[PDB]
Amino acid sequence: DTGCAVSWSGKELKCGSGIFVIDNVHTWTEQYKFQPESPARLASAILNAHEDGVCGIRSTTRLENIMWKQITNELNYVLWEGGHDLTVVAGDVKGVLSKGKRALAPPVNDLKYSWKTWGKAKIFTPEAKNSTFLIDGPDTSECPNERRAWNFLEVEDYGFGMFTTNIWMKFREGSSEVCDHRLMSAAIKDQKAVHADMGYWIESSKNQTWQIEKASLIEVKTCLWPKTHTLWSNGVLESQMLIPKAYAGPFSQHNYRQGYATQTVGPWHLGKLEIDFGECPGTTVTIQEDCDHRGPSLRTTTASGKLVTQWCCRSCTMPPLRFLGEDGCWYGMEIRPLSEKEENMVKSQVSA
Amino acid sequence: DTGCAVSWSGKELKCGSGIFVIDNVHTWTEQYKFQPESPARLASAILNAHEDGVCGIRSTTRLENIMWKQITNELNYVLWEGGHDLTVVAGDVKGVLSKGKRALAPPVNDLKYSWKTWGKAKIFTPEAKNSTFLIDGPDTSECPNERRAWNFLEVEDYGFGMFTTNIWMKFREGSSEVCDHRLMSAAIKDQKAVHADMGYWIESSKNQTWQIEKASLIEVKTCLWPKTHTLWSNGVLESQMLIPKAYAGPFSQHNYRQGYATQTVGPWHLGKLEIDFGECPGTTVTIQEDCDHRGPSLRTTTASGKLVTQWCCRSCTMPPLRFLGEDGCWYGMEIRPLSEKEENMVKSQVSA
Amino acid sequence: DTGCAVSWSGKELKCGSGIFVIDNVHTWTEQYKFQPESPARLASAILNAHEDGVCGIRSTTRLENIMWKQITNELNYVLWEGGHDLTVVAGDVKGVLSKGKRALAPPVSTFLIDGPDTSECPNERRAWNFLEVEDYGFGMFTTNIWMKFREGSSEVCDHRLMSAAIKDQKAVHADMGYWIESSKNQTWQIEKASLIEVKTCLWPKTHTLWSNGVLESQMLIPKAYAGPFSQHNYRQGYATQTVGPWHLGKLEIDFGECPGTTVTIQEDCDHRGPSLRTTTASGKLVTQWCCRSCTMPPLRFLGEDGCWYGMEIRPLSEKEENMVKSQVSA
Amino acid sequence: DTGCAVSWSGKELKCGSGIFVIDNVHTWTEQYKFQPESPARLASAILNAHEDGVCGIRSTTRLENIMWKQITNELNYVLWEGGHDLTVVAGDVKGVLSKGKRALAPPVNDLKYSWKTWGKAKIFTPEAKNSTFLIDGPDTSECPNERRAWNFLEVEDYGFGMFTTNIWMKFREGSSEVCDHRLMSAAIKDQKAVHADMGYWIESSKNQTWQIEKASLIEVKTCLWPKTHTLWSNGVLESQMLIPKAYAGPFSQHNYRQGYATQTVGPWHLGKLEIDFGECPGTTVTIQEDCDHRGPSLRTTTASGKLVTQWCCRSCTMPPLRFLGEDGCWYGMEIRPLSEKEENMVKSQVSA
Amino acid sequence: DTGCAVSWSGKELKCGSGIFVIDNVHTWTEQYKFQPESPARLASAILNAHEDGVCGIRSTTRLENIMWKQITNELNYVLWEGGHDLTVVAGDVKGVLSKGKRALAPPFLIDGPDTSECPNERRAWNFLEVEDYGFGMFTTNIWMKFREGSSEVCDHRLMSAAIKDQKAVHADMGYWIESSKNQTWQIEKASLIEVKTCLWPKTHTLWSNGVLESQMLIPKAYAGPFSQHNYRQGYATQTVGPWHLGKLEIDFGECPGTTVTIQEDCDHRGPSLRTTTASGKLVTQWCCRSCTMPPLRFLGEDGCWYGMEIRPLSEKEENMVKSQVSA
Amino acid sequence: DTGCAVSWSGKELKCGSGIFVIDNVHTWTEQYKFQPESPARLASAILNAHEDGVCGIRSTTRLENIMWKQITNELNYVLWEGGHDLTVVAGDVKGVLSKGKRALAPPFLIDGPDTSECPNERRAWNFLEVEDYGFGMFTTNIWMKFREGSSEVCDHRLMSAAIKDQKAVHADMGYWIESSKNQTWQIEKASLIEVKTCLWPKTHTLWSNGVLESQMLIPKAYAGPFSQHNYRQGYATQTVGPWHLGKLEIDFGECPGTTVTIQEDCDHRGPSLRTTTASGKLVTQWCCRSCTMPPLRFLGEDGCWYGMEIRPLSEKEENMVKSQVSA
C-alpha cells in the first residue's frame, strides 16, 4: 500500500510502501457494500435448502444483514417467476449475531433468469404464505437456530473507489466455524498493536506490560478469530482472554488485562459496545478484600433511574473495566456493589 | 498513523487512522541515525567494563556500527583528556553480526566533559597506551567473543522529520538475548503478511496455503525475534522455519515453505541476501528420488568460474529455493548438484 | 491539472502538473448529467423537424437517452399547449446506438425518441448526432454538462468528451463509454476494452495515437462502431470484427478462455464466420473449439448473457446449426 | 496511475485511475537520474569500440551527459588497474546535441572487478598517455562526428521513490535513429494536447483550430520522435512542422501554426529555449506585401545594443513567433526588419 | 499541523510542523458542518424560552441557520409528541445577521424577514458554542452546545489569524480579510460570505494596540478585527456601506467605465451609492475629497458599489441607488 | 500556500490555501544561511566606520555570527589588498547576544567576550536587513543588505505568528513560543536556540492590548512578545533567570528527583538557583510563596533550574549556583 502517513506523535511524515491497517469502525467515509452472486443462483440455493429442511438464514455480520434486507424483493420476484411457493422475509438484527448449524451449498442446476445485476424496480409479489424463509429477526421457536444457515458466504474480490466500495461475495466450499479471514487485519509497531475487521477495533499498547486498553464493537459476532491473523498466539489460556473466545475475540496475549478474567457474562446483549477503563460518572470503586465473588455484569442505574454510588472490587486493578452501552454504563464481572443491593438492579440478559 | 494509501491492486484510495508498516530496507529516503547517550556516560561505562574484564563490543545491528564509528574519536578524546590508559578501535562488519557474552552496565559517577551533544573542536590523540578496546572487526583470538559486549542498547524515543530522523538510545537495565522490540513491526491484511525490521523484510502470501514468498536481508543478526511481534506463533516446529531461529527468524508459521526444512547451513556468511523462489540464470532443477541427502548450500559457479547446469532435489517443491548475493546465485540445502562433482564446488562457510 | 499519483507498479509517487486522463466508465463517483438548452427551444426544434419529414431521433450516447427520458415530459405540455397536434413518444435502448440520416436545426402523428426497429418511422427519416457540449462541471459528488445544438451535419463523435494518453509502455483511448487499453509486450497491441455502450459515430483523428499507415481491415474494433483509427487498435492474428456480439450493448473485450473451454490451432477447421456463444439454446456447454491461424490467448467477449469467441475461432465437436450466432447484419 | 488532481481552473477536485503525464521541465527539483550498468561493462565496451575506430561519445539527452560526467572516474580507475592504457575525459555540452554515426556494442568478455556498484576505490588515476576518449565537449577535428558513438543506451526499468527516482539503463541491441520511446509521453483531453519528454514540453490547444501555442525546450536533441507516441500523425507534411523533424519535433498536426513553416534555420544553437507567440519588449510587427523572402532568424538587439523596432512579415499572422533565449529575444524565419539590413546584425549559426 | 505546502511563488515545497490557516471562504467543497446537541434538549430549551417570553432566535453564522433549517422538522415532531401548542418556523436570512437581545437557557419564528409582531428586542441570539471537532477529511462535523452565560463576542473556536514575512490574514468560517506591506501595513482585500454583528475577540487579533474605532474599514459593529491591519490610507469606517447585500467582495480598483478624481471642492462624506441608476444608466464620472487610489470597491449581486467618500460629480443625488442602512 | 496537513489531534486531514507557519527551530531540513551584501562594500563600510570611531560590531542573530566568521578571512584579505592598517577577528558568542549602541553607516572585534578595550557602548549592532529569499528545498539562502537608519526592533521579515482554535504560537528562526487555553490563555512551552535583545515588533504580535511589562514571562528586554499570550499564572517577569546559558528550554514540569510545595512562610523573590550545588550535590526540597503547579523550569545545557519565585528549603542560598545576570 503505497502512500504517506504521520506518526502517532505527529512529529514525523513517512512515505513508502507496506501494509496500512485502517480503522473501518470510524471509517471517515461511506461503508463497504456487499454484493451477492446473482438472483438466479441465490434463489436456487434457497430453494434447495428449503427442500433439505433449512427454515431460514442467520447472518454473520451487519453488512450481510444489510445485503439480505436489500436483495429480498428481487429474490421474491425470482422465486415467484418459477411458479413455486416460497416467501423470503428479512428481519433486523437485535443483540448478539447468533449462529445456525446448517449451510447453503453452491447450487447446481441453476434457475432461469435474464439479468445478473440487482435492482430494476420489480413488483411486490403478494405473500403466498404457507412457506416462509425467515432471515434474521427475533429468536422464535418455529424456526430455531438449530435449522438455520450460517457462515456460508466469503469474499471473492474487492471493488474500486474512494468513498463507495463494493465487495463481491460467493458461497463457501464447506462448513466452517471460523470468521472470514479476507475481511480481517492485525498490526503491531513500536509499542502499539491492533486487531481489526469490519466491525471490531481492539487496540492494545505497552505501559510496563502488554495489555488491552480499548475496544469498539459495533457488532457482536460468534464465529472464531482465525489464528493466521493473530499476534502472540502462543501460550494463550482461554480463561484469561478479556473478550471471550465465543464472541470472536482474538486468541492472543494482547487480548488480556491484568486482574481480570474472561468476561463471559458481560453486557453482550446490547450489540454495539465500547470497552474502556475508567469510572462511570458519579461512582467510586475501591479494592477491598471483603467483597463478593464474580457474577453477571450490572448497570450503575436501577430500572427506576436511581444511580448506585459505591462499588467494591476484590482483586482487580484500577481503573475498573467499564462498558458503554446505549442505555447506560456497565461494569465488569469482578466489580460488585455494596451501596445498594444486588437483587434490586439490572443484570446481564445473557444466559449464565 | 493518519494518512492515505493506494492498495496493492491500485484501484482504491483509502484514508484514515491506523498503523502503517513501512518497508525500511527500501527506505525511499535516508536511513535512520542512531544517537548515543553522551561522551561522558559512554566513556565511563567502557572504562568500567574494561576494568571488570570486558574486552570488546559486538554490534547487534548494522545501524549501530555506524554510530560506534562516528563516536569513536570523541570517546578517545574523552579518555585521553581524562588521563586514562586505553584506546578505542572501531572495526567494520563483515558477515554475520556475531554474538557476545557480556554487556555494559549503566555507569554511576560519570566522567567530566565540556558539552552534552556530539561534535566540537577537538584534537587527534595518538594511538598509544598499549591497551585497546576493539569494536567489531574480524574474528580474533586476542579478543574472543566470550569477553565481548552485545545487545546493551535500546530505543528511548524517536526524532522528527521526513528524510533524516534520529533515534536516541540508552542502556538496557538487564541482559537479554532478544532483539530490541521498538525497532520491529508486523502486519497482515486480506492475504498478505509481513515481518518488518530495520534490516529484515519477510513477505508471505496465500495461494492455497500460507507460506513465505520473499525475504530481503541487508544484515544477518543473531538475537531472537520477540514473540510479541509475531503473527501465528502457535504450534511452530523449529525444524520447519525457513529462516532459522538462530538468525532472528520469526517464530511463526508464515516463516515456512512447503517441502523445505530449516536452512541452518545456508550462505549466511554473505551478509546481504535476497531470498526468492525461482531458477538461477542458466540452470535447471528436477525431482528425483535417487538423489543424495541434503547438505551445505552450494553455488552454481565453481571456483574456476564455470557453470553447473544439472541439479536435482529429493522431495523438494518447485520453484526451488534460491539465495542471491554479491558472489552469485545459491541454492538451498535440499537441491544437490548432478553434473559437477560436488567435491569440487564452493560450499557455505557456515559451520556444519 | 495538479496533484499526485501512484504509478501502475505501485513503486513511485509522483507529484506535479500536467494532464490527468481518468477512467470515466468506472467513475469513482456518480455519472454525468446532460443538461439541454431550454424547454422551449427544443419544442420549437422538434416541431420544425416534424413539419418537414423527420419522424424521430436516435441517441448517440447512453447519456442522451437519459436526458431525453427526463425531458420528454416538459417537451409535451408546451407541444400540446400551442395547439399543435403532435405528441413525442419516448423509448429505451437495447443493442447498438443505430445511425440516422437526418438532423434537427436550431429554432428561429407521433415523434419517437429511440426504441425498437419500426417500419412506421425508419432510420432514414430520423435525426442523429446533432447535440454538442458547451462547458463542463468536472468534480466530485455532482457533475453537469450543458449541451447545445450542432450547426452542420457530421458523422464524427463529439470530441469534447474524449481523451487519449500514452506514457512509457501503456496507451489508452478513453471516452464517456469507451475504455480501450494498449500495451507493449514485444509489440504494441490491444490488451483490454470495457464497452459500457456501442456507438456508431466516428472517432476523431485529432484524439488518436499512431494514426498513420492504418488499414480498415485490421482494426479489432471496427471503425463503424467508433473504433479508433490507430495501430494501437490491433491484435496480432485477428482482423476487423465486422460480425461480432455487438447486439448485447455492454461488452468486455479481453483475451482468455471462457470457463470450461479450450481452444487449439488446427488447419482442419471451418473458415472465418460469425461469432458464436458457448451455450446452445437449451444451455449445453460446448468445450472444443479451434482456430486456423490465430494467436493465444484467444479473443473473448463477455456479455451479460454468457461468453463468446471471435470470428476466427470455430467449434469442432458440435454443429453450428444448433448454436446461437450473433444477431447483426452479415 | 491512481491518484487525485485539481482541475485546470483550480475550482474542482477529481480522483480516479488512468495515465498522469507530468511536466518534467518545471518540476521544482530534478525528478529522474540515470544509472549505468556496471563499471566493468562500460570500460570493456569502450575498449572494444576503440579497437574498432570509435574515438568518442555524443550525448542523446542532457540527463545522460550528467551520468557520464559523474561516472567518468571509476572508468579511469578500471582502465588503469587493467594494465592497458586509455584515458577518458568528459566534457560539457554546447547548444545542440549533435548526432554521431557509431555505437558501442555490448562486450562479449569483461574486465575483472570487485564491485558491482559505483563510488569506491579511487585515488586520482594519474594516467593519460595521449590515449583520449573524448565525451561530449566542443566540435573538434581530431575526432569528428563521423567517427563518434551516439544513441546506444535504452531504459531497462524504473526505480522507486517520491522525489528522485533512478532510471536503470542498458545497451541497445541494434543501431537506430529514433529516440528511446520509454522516456516519452503524449496526452489529449477535451481541447488541450501535449507532447512531453525529459526535456521537451510542447503544448497545443484549440481556438477555432488546433495549432501549437507554447513550447519549452531545455535541450535540443537530434533523434526522431517515435510515431507510436504521436497524436494525429496522418497527412503530415514535413514542410509545415513548426519544430523541424531533425530536432526531435513530433510528426503531428498539432505541431503546426497558421502562416508559418518549418523553422530549419531558427536559433537552435542556444540549447534552452522558450517558444512563445507575442512581441519582444518594445517592438512592432506589421504585415506588408512587399516584404522580402524568407531568411534566417535574427536577434532584436545588435552586439552593440541597438534595438531594432521595425519588423515586417509577408504572410504571417499575429501574434508573431518569438524565441526567448539566454542572450535575448529572437524572431522566426518569416519576420524581417524594416530598419537596418541583414549585414550588421547577428544571424543563427545553423546554416546549410 | 504536520504536512507540506507549496509557497506563493510556486517554486518551493516546504514541509514541517506548525499551524496551517486555511481559507474556508474559497473551498473545493463544503469543509465543515454544524451538528446539534440532541432533539430532546433542543425542544425543552425552546419550550422554556417560549414561556420565558421570547418568540424566536436569530442565527449568528450562516451554518447555524442551516443547522436550524435541517433540524426544525425533528424539533416540531418532538414538540408535537410532547403535547403542546408551539410551532417553529425556520425561515431564511436576508443580508445582515441582526442581533437579538435575549437568550436560551440550558435545562416561534426562526430568522426570516423583520416583523414588528416579533421584534429583535424579544428574541434570542448567540447562545451556541463549539464543544468538539469531528474526524474526517471532507465532511468534518462540529458539535454544538449551550453557553452558561451571555456575551456579545463571536465564538473563538472557529476563528484564526496568521502573519508571515509581509502577509497577514484574519479568517473564520465566513470571513477572509487579507493585508500586506507595501511601504505601509494596510488592508488589501476581503471576502465576506456573511455579515455578522458579534465582536471579533482580541485573543485572535494581530496588532491590537493603539486602534481607534474610526479608521477600521470593516466597522466594529459588523465583526471587524480591532487591528491596525484593518486600515487603509485616507479612508475611515464604512458604517453606512452596502452591508444589506449579504455576500460581499471588498477590493480596491476601478469598475468598468468609471473614473475618480481627487478635488477639495467635492461633496462631503455620505452614504454609499451604486454605480448604476435605478433605470440602469451608467455614471462614468465620480469624485472624492481626500481619498487615495485605488478607491473602495464593493462587489456583490448588484455589480458594483463605491465607498462613502467616492461621490459622483457628473450626476446628482436625486436619482441614485443608496445604501439601505440608516444612520 | 497550498497543501494538506493533519490536525494536532491527528484525527482529520485538511487541504486548501492559506498561510502555513512552520517551526524553523526544528527545521526538518538544513538550517538557513545569510549572505552579505557585497564583499567589497563591507570592507568600505568597515573602513569608514572605524574612521568614524567604532571598534567592531555585535551580532544580533546566531545566523549572522556564522556569516561573519565565514567571511572574516576574505574581508581581512580585502583589507590587506589595499595595505590598510586594521585587523578583524571573528570570535564566538556564548550566552546573551548583548546590544551595541552604534550603527554601521553604508559606504575591530566581532563578538567575543566582554572585552574592556572595546565596550558595548561604542560598538555597532542591528544593522542588517533581509531583501530577498530565492529558492531551494534542501538549502535556501538569505540575501542581506544595510539598514537605512537606527532601529532597536528585530527584523520582521524572519518572524511569524498564528492562532487557531485554542493554540497560538510566536515564531522566528531562533524562537518558538507556544501558547494554549485551558480555562485561560497561558504560555505552555518555549524553545530558544539563542537569547536576543532587540524588541519583538508589535505588528507580528497577537493580543497586544493592555499588556503590563512586569507580567511578561519572557522579558521585553529579551525579545519577548508584547502579548498576553506571553503570560503564566502565579509568576512575574523572569528578569534574573538563567539567560546566560544561550540555548534554553522553558517548560512547566519537575526537574528529576526533586519536589516542590507551596508554603506561606517562604522567602521573597530573588535570583534563580540550580537544583545542583556548586560541587554536585542535589537539592530536593523547594518552596514558593504564591506559585501555581507545575513549577517553572529552565532545562539548560548544564542542568535544571527553577524560576525566580521558587526558593530552596533544605539548602542555604549562600553557597549555591546563582544566575550571573544583573544579580
Side-chain angles (χ1 to χ4, degrees), chain D residues 166-181:
Chain D
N166 287 7
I167 302 167
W168 295 97
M169 320 293 313
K170 75 182 209 299
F171 280 117
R172 297 175 71 93
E173 291 288 81
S175 295
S176 72
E177 294 187 356
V178 189
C179 319
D180 192 22
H181 74 85

Side-chain angles (χ1 to χ4, degrees), chain A residues 36-47 67-68 71 75 79 104 107 110 118 152-153 171:
Chain A
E37 272 277 334
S38 179
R41 304 195 39 119
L42 289 177
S44 301
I46 284 173
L47 211 53
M67 176 192 82
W68 284 119
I71 73 189
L75 274 182
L79 281 190
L104 308 195
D110 178 70
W118 290 90
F152 52 85
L153 295 161
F171 288 108

Side-chain angles (χ1 to χ4, degrees), chain B residues 2-4 17 115-117 160-163, chain F residues 6 10-11 13 26-29 137-138 301:
Chain B
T2 308
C4 299
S17 299
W115 309 125
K116 187 179 65 184
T117 183
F160 50 78
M162 175 159 65
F163 321 97
Chain F
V6 299
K11 57 167 60 174
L13 190 147
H26 308 109
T27 309
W28 276 37
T29 43
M137 181 169 186
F138 312 89
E301 179 79 32

Side-chain angles (χ1 to χ4, degrees), chain D residues 281-302:
Chain D
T283 309
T284 64
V285 185
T286 50
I287 301 173
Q288 201 58 251
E289 200 70 30
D290 50 51
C291 176
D292 59 304
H293 65 294
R294 222 185 183 200
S297 179
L298 309 155
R299 197 177 39 194
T300 51
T301 72
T302 300

